[PDB]
Amino acid sequence: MHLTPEEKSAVTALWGKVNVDEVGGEALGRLLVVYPWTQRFFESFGDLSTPDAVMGNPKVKAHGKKVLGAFSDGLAHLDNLKGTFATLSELHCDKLHVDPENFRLLGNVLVCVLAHHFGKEFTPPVQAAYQKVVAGVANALAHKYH
Amino acid sequence: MHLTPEEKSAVTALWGKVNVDEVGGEALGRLLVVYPWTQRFFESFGDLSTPDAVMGNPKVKAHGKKVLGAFSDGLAHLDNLKGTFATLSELHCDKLHVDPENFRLLGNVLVCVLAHHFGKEFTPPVQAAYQKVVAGVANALAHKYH
Amino acid sequence: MLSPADKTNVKAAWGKVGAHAGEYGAEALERMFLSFPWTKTYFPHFDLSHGSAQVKGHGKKVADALTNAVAHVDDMPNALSALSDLHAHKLRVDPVNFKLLSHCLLVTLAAHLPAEFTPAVHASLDKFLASVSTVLTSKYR
Amino acid sequence: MLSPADKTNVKAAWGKVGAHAGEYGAEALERMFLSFPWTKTYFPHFDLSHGSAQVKGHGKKVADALTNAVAHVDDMPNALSALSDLHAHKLRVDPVNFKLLSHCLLVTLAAHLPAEFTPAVHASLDKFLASVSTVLTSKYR
Numbered sequence A, B: 001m002h003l004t005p006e007e008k009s010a011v012t013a014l015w016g017k018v019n020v021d022e023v024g025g026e027a028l029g030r031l032l033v034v035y036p037w038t039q040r041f042f043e044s045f046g047d048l049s050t051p052d053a054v055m056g057n058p059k060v061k062a063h064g065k066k067v068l069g070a071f072s073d074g075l076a077h078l079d080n081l082k083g084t085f086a087t088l089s090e091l092h093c094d095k096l097h098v099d100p101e102n103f104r105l106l107g108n109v110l111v112c113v114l115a116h117h118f119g120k121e122f123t124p125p126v127q128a129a130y131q132k133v134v135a136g137v138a139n140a141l142a143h144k145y146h
Numbered sequence C, D: 001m002l003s004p005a006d007k008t009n010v011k012a013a014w015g016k017v018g019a020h021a022g023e024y025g026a027e028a029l030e031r032m033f034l035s036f037p038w039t040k041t042y043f044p045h046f047d048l049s050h051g052s053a054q055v056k057g058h059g060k061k062v063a064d065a066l067t068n069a070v071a072h073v074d075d076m077p078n079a080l081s082a083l084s085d086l087h088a089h090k091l092r093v094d095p096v097n098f099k100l101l102s103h104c105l106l107v108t109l110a111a112h113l114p115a116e117f118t119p120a121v122h123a124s125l126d127k128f129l130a131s132v133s134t135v136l137t138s139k140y141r
């Protein structure tokens, strides 16, 4: 996408403080709790019946970590998200059949998680920068659908 | 945007049969009837109180014609909608304050109007091509918002 | 909220659809799969090629449900109760897709009812499809 | 539909908001204008710079309305009747923007209620804001 250098440095700085494994597990878990229809892709994962079951489910945590790790790696290529995520885009379409609306939901939950985590440090300008990034990633992941 | 040559020729062929003034008046009128909150920009236009008043309102017809004419001219530059609509994009943001969601609503109403007009000639593949075009135009018009 | 006039408009239009309801249902689906390819992610188990029996069959089911909703327009939540359970707990289609199908249904009706699809009827039908969509997504959470 | 548990969660969270409701309302607005610039098209008559009295004033009004909705969560349509008339017939804000403000309100709450903003409360709050949004857009057509 297009971030101003001050937006880019805002995103970069905050992300250096993120425990990717922890935030990943939290974001995926909250996605499954707040928007329960997203559970549709994960019934191989065990008990998802209550909020506590979802948040404590080890498969959810593991997958959350895998997703946010790939997300992390994309922050290093903000200039070319589409190229970075082309293969994953294809995979999510052809093999996993994930409606790309899910990427948008996850992006918004991730922003809530960052806000919860960082409190007042997650200022309105920083949120704005992260919104552009998550929209960009969702875009990039949806790009090769057909 | 990106149309296959068969999509491009489908769009082009159908459009050669459109009375731009008539379809323009119809599409804008139906926008104002089906989504009445869009009337917010037009209270300078007179009586918009009933469907018949809206569809017969001469200012609505005139504006519809102006809008679809610009749309028409954009069909000639499908390769570079953003460049074609940059000035209008700016105008709609800075001076007219039109929420770009309105462009999407109009695009969908325009597709309904074409379907109503052309009946069975407006096949599923032709609709698909037009959906890409109206999304592209909405995009192009929203591009310079800030 | 459907006004009495909206209900009259929907019954009139759907009345004229009559026996073609199933054929129109299939056409709307095909329009949706071509115009909004992301919707195909919910049908990986179907042959989505043109004229496929699976799509025609599904189109007929969708159409019959809408017929049921028109017949019970004053009591839709009850009439569609089993269908809202099915979409909420089983199918779990993201709510945004309901809009997409609604639009394609509207386009299909427009293409087949030249005389019936007046501005006022268009408005009533869009309202009606939004209400059906709201009921079908009622129990998602 | 808000379950009793959802209502308990919303009352608890909003309770902790208490007296800061107005300040949080303004922050949510500012977040919305920066993250989703298209929403500024509804406020051309405001000074939208940081700390502007107009935004603070408006934030307080938004917050008081939400406070009113929490107090009358069993009877929201009635409680917000004047506000739904106002948005439907006067302001005519496109319904998509309600989502955007709801998200920014959620972010604001998350940033200020570290202990309260559990997964279950998050879910209840999102549901609640969606219900408020539904009521405020009820009379648009």
Ligand code: HEM
Residues within 6 Å of the ligand: A038, A041, A042, A063, A066, A067, A068, A070, A071, A088, A091, A092, A096, A098, A102, A103, A106, A137, A141
């Ligand atoms: C930030 C956005 C996302 C990114 C970066 C991402 C990335 C990934 C990666 C790296 C994998 C592993 C691929 C492999 O094995 O080769 C994966 C798998 C998968 N993802 Fe996504 N993903 C994202 C969002 C989502 C969302 C929102 C959902 C659905 C709610 C989803 C559902 C899945 C599923 C079901 C798999 C398969 C897991 C398995 O085999 O057990 N992903 N994703």
Ligand code: HEM
Residues within 6 Å of the ligand: B038, B041, B042, B063, B066, B067, B068, B070, B071, B088, B091, B092, B096, B098, B102, B103, B106, B137, B141
């Ligand atoms: C296909 C999308 C659209 C295109 C191509 C378009 C194009 C135009 C053009 C050519 C003008 C005249 C500009 C000038 O005077 O220099 C205009 C004006 C205007 N448009 Fe758009 N427009 C579109 C959609 C919309 C929508 C959906 C709305 C709101 C519902 C809207 C609201 C207005 C208004 C209020 C004006 C000012 C009219 C006046 O001064 O009386 N337009 N547009």
Ligand code: HEM
Residues within 6 Å of the ligand: C039, C042, C043, C058, C061, C062, C065, C066, C083, C086, C087, C091, C093, C097, C098, C099, C101, C132, C133, C136
């Ligand atoms: C107007 C709204 C809709 C109506 C009235 C409707 C109605 C139905 C009905 C009657 C069934 C068959 C249930 C049965 O077997 O007993 C069904 C199944 C299904 N629907 Fe919905 N539906 C609607 C919207 C959607 C949308 C938007 C999607 C996805 C884009 C969708 C995806 C499905 C799928 C995947 C099935 C299962 C098909 C199968 O496995 O055979 N539906 N729907």
Ligand code: HEM
Residues within 6 Å of the ligand: D039, D042, D043, D058, D061, D062, D065, D066, D083, D086, D087, D091, D093, D097, D098, D099, D101, D132, D133, D136
């Ligand atoms: C949670 C949803 C919202 C609530 C509870 C809410 C509440 C209110 C209230 C209490 C007022 C003041 C009414 C009065 O003066 O008596 C108002 C005005 C207004 N609202 Fe809404 N609102 C909401 C969403 C929105 C959204 C999403 C937008 C646009 C993005 C918006 C735009 C406006 C505008 C333009 C005014 C007029 C401000 C002025 O001229 O001073 N509202 N709202």
